[PDB]
């Protein structure tokens, strides 16, 4: 099924041609164009009052990366390196070393925000829900080096946004 | 972020259509941002027998 | 006292600069689309005093939005040179920040900072238009904290 | 206090030009479902002052290939003529009651193109020279019809003095007598002011910034001054010509209010059409006039030449 | 929701108001209240010059009627 | 007289970096290829990889794919027409329809988590199921989108200025268009009756009913009218997809080409092993080569 | 008729915001004069209003606190001044405000939501979080030779 978008021949009756000449001389579709914009000025604007008003999001939103931890206090990360092995941009660097207690934890877990693509592949690959993409997105920095995240900075993000991230995962883990 | 009746007639006449019926601003018809938990189904291979991967 | 007078002059000049930041139409890649969406009615750059303007001669802030490649870097550096001072560079997106997805490619500059002095680093791939608006407001506060005439008074 | 009058015809005009930018960025933005400038103080009432401050403290670079002398004399020419052409307007009582006000304003409007001309040529750019030539063609084409339409309309006035128009439209608006020409006249006012949909001298989409491309900071703000003062003055002239208003000799404030309201409405229609159309393509805006505006306006010129004679309605010259 | 637009015109209206009144008032102040006499032709200028001569104080607006003559 | 385009001013080595990344790792590259139509690129790549793997996504995944592909067609056509008008000079429709574009970005982020680069459509189906209460919002938006399309038409279709800068401006001959490698609108806009959604249907495009807007003259105006009519037909397809959503899963029920559910991974041996290997090594694609193409909105 | 009511509720705008002084306070600070039910308030002072009548996007909003963490925020504010618990409710990611549904509490969660620490001397400086790899010979001290 196809339709001819522009295959309309105009009628050549005296009334039709008089109307076409009137539209040409007395600009008619031009007045319609004016009227449409008049109708929308009288309409309500769509602008929101940022930063006092924020655009809507979803619990699945991908933002600032963060390392979570168990309710006991121990970090969830076990240095299985799935996130490092699955990152499309190779933005994660992990070095592991058996801790004094014996549990295997990262001696270095750096995520480079200037190289990250915010795909969320790491948070899917993680088998313990250790690394997540937090809800934060207003974390712009004045210098480049501040975007090269360390293990300590990611742990601070996890401890800061934990209230939001726990609820976000709680409202989405069933879909996964 | 509702227009008076006098204004609505001006908007409608300037456009030639009932704008109040179909607006581009979502007021309350949207789905509630908090939703009940879902129960996702299983695929056609979640069987406990006759489920050999060779087939 | 002279310090108070130069202080007030600083506040006036900084307020003008921050309240009429005129950006440049230098969208490069997908990061430009969000650069358009904050110009879209929802976020609307215009209410914050920021109005898009080409012809670098009459613009202040450059939002490098998109991947900066080797073939384009001379053009970007030259165009940054055309901007009369004061000038600011906002880097949108991971590609313009440090390389992004194609950080290991053969024809991509590994960060816009290597070509121009970037003033605000906006992260994202692409950054949400809210995040870019936040970066612009951060630049606005940066201009607010300038101390030009104070330093001149303590030359 | 003649100096007082001269200053009272300059500073208020400059302030009105400044707020024209704000009302444009608000009316346009509300056409496009946006809100326009809203942050600086209440309702953006400080944006004109803010960007006014920026443009006169931002560095005014001079290109290495420029011609210094004309590059500087062009903004002065533009602003000086834009401000000067406000003096013969018969706002209740014109400041300069000239016997040939219409011809004078035509002369200064024709001179105002030379600012664009010299600014474009002296800047030494491909885009600037392109915009200068587009300005050449546009203003010549539209100036022919400007002159003819002015003659046709003023044939019922009896002379070229601006004040007598008020006497001419004592009982009826002149637009009810020459509504066809008025349409054409309005279009000409859109094009001579180099505004939409004929703003091809700038051509932001295709010429980056046209003849302002190498103009930065103060000189750019000054060319913008000239452009917007010309916009308001053209709308004022159109209001004076066609949409006359009652004038009580004892209370000129009534005529001031009515005239100002009509100029405001005409300017608002200018921003209205600016935000409701695509942009013309060079030759079209020429082929629009030399093939559709010029013959119609010639015919209307003959019609208005004959009309007082056939009806014994020749207006007095004094 | 365009009432926020309205202040922009309002102050601007005041701007466009300021000259139209001021000139008029100036024309009334500098010419003794009455309208500024306009000389579009030589006859009007001759009348104005004779007014300046008769006034004795060299201002044309100062007018003398029946009291001046015997 | 001559117009030499010097492309390469944005040449990222995409086709070189793709080799160094696995098939799952190469998925976000296609989202970053065409930044106005995004799920269509992922759909093309997923169809290619599925065809190589000799697997098929579940019917619900196919229906979600076609629904979001039509949404992406709406996005791309909105961009094309609005920025086209902006380049010609009409700027208001750009904002007017970019409000709707933000509305669809809301759907993109609500489903995938990102406004622009969803990385949603993947070889084997889709990443995760639609959030509860999303079909209602899509229906609410598509109910009113017709008014915005009509407003754009009233703004541009009959204007004597637009109808003069686009009528008979850039005419291309039918055989010249075919020989020049043109595809999509530039075929449909010049009488050539061709559309991959109908001629070589993929996914479940053989179920939805729609009309292809064949052009007449081949100029700019005809192509613009074709694009608007494609917007309307895609709206029809969105309505059909919303009304015909089938029950089922979201990915092929094969843990060797699609990662197992997070619940199964944390409980069972085979799910954990397959998740580990898929997210570390990936699914080995059988040797061979294929060329799979789709009617992208371009 | 609706003209009179429209002129009237513009006075409820000034009445709701604590009179004229608060009216200009909110007008000059938050650039809006619209009123709304006080959904809640956080420990840092930000006030959190909601009005379901507004279209989706402006149904909820914040008036930021005047002071947070030793910084005057009367005139300069940003989107990072939102505590994590309320960032969910503000961004329409849930319909449950922290007042009604409070987020689960844990020891490691912070008690003072620091804003964007860029610029201030409390910035973040990247550094290697791992120890050395190759050790040195540390030559002996006895001259011996
Ligand atoms: C008619 C009279 C023309 C007189 C004349 O020679 O005008 C040259 C004057 C400048 O020529 P130019 O091509 O800009 O070259 C200027 C420098 O040589 C080239 O550029 P520059 O950067 O060297 O310009 C600075 C230069 C030249 O001075 C200027 O540019 C200052 C402005 C012109 C001053 C003369 O300063 C000096 O030479 C030292 C001045 C002490 O050209 C004009 O068209 C001026 C005419 C003014 C007429 C009256 C207008 C009212
Ligand atoms: C042509 C202009 C004629 C004079 C003004 C007429 C006018 O706007 O009356 C208000 C009234 C409502 O304002 P609107 O322009 O319809 O926009 C209302 C929106 O729905 C938005 O309404 P809303 O949702 O915001 O709710 C009610 C709203 C209602 O809006 C107002 O109360 C604004 C009216 C001034 C107070 O109250 C407020 O928003 C108060 C904010 C006031 C800000 C300052 C406005 C200054 C206006 C110019 C003053 C003189 C210069 O006007 C009409 O309903 C149309 C009357 C047309 C009369 C033409 C006579 C010739
Ligand atoms: C297909 O893929 C594509 C990409 O893919 C990667 C791309 O990247 C890109 C490229 C990307 C882009 C182009 C980015 C997107 C851009 C946009 C969508 C554009 C958006 C634009 C806007 C939102 C803004 C539009 C502007 C509007 C509506 C209006 C502008 C008008 C104005 C007037 C602005 C204000 C300016 C000025 C100069 C006015 C201010 C000046 C004054 C007030 C001066 C006042 C002075 C005084 C008062 C002086 C007074 C003096 C006195 C009294 C006395 C003086 C005397 C003395 C002696 C001193 C594209 C296009 C693309 O398609
Ligand atoms: C009406 C407008 C009223 C206000 C006008 C303010 C104009 C300010 C212009 C910029 C400041 C220049 C100044 O006074 O001293 C420059 C002073 C000079 O002090 P300085 O020694 O730092 O010099 C600046 C550095 N160089 C020389 C490289 C440019 O500098 C600054 O203010 C900026 C630092
Ligand atoms: C040539 C020289 C000419 C010199 C003329 C003399 C005056 C020139 C300068 C005038 C402005 C000086 C600066 C003070 C005002 C200012 O900009 O404040 C900004 C500051 C900016 O503060 P801010 O930076 O916090 O604002 C942005 C951030 N948010 C939105 C979150 C608050 O605001 C104020 O001080 C508030 C002022 C409110 C009232 C403003 C005036 C209203 C009435 C205007 C009537 C029309 C006038 C024409
Ligand atoms: S979400 Fe960021 S850190 Fe995780 S895999 Fe993607 S780019 Fe890497
Ligand atoms: S995938 Fe999770 S557990 Fe494994 S190394 Fe990464 S953060 Fe740690
Ligand atoms: S940072 Fe991401 S969105 Fe921005 S240009 Fe690079 S790949 Fe595209």
mmCIF file of C-alpha atoms and ligand atoms in Angstrom, chain A residues 77-83 94 109 126-128 130-131, ligand 7:
data_model
loop_
_atom_site.group_PDB
_atom_site.id
_atom_site.type_symbol
_atom_site.label_atom_id
_atom_site.label_comp_id
_atom_site.label_asym_id
_atom_site.label_seq_id
_atom_site.Cartn_x
_atom_site.Cartn_y
_atom_site.Cartn_z
ATOM 1 C CA UNK A 77 32.966 -5.701 45.660
ATOM 2 C CA UNK A 78 35.032 -8.896 45.580
ATOM 3 C CA UNK A 79 37.329 -7.970 42.662
ATOM 4 C CA UNK A 80 35.934 -10.515 40.216
ATOM 5 C CA UNK A 81 36.789 -7.962 37.484
ATOM 6 C CA UNK A 82 33.642 -8.619 35.432
ATOM 7 C CA UNK A 83 32.986 -4.873 35.227
ATOM 8 C CA UNK A 94 41.199 -2.956 39.107
ATOM 9 C CA UNK A 109 39.338 0.384 41.869
ATOM 10 C CA UNK A 126 28.414 -7.191 38.695
ATOM 11 C CA UNK A 127 27.265 -10.426 40.394
ATOM 12 C CA UNK A 128 26.993 -8.798 43.843
ATOM 13 C CA UNK A 130 28.670 -3.719 44.066
ATOM 14 C CA UNK A 131 29.158 -1.140 41.294
HETATM 15 S S1 LIG H 7 31.920 -6.590 38.790
HETATM 16 FE FE1 LIG H 7 31.355 -5.887 40.884
HETATM 17 S S2 LIG H 7 32.341 -7.403 42.269
HETATM 18 FE FE2 LIG H 7 33.318 -7.670 40.228
HETATM 19 S S3 LIG H 7 35.164 -6.336 40.315
HETATM 20 FE FE3 LIG H 7 33.504 -5.071 39.399
HETATM 21 S S4 LIG H 7 32.581 -3.988 41.181
HETATM 22 FE FE4 LIG H 7 33.826 -5.689 42.044
#
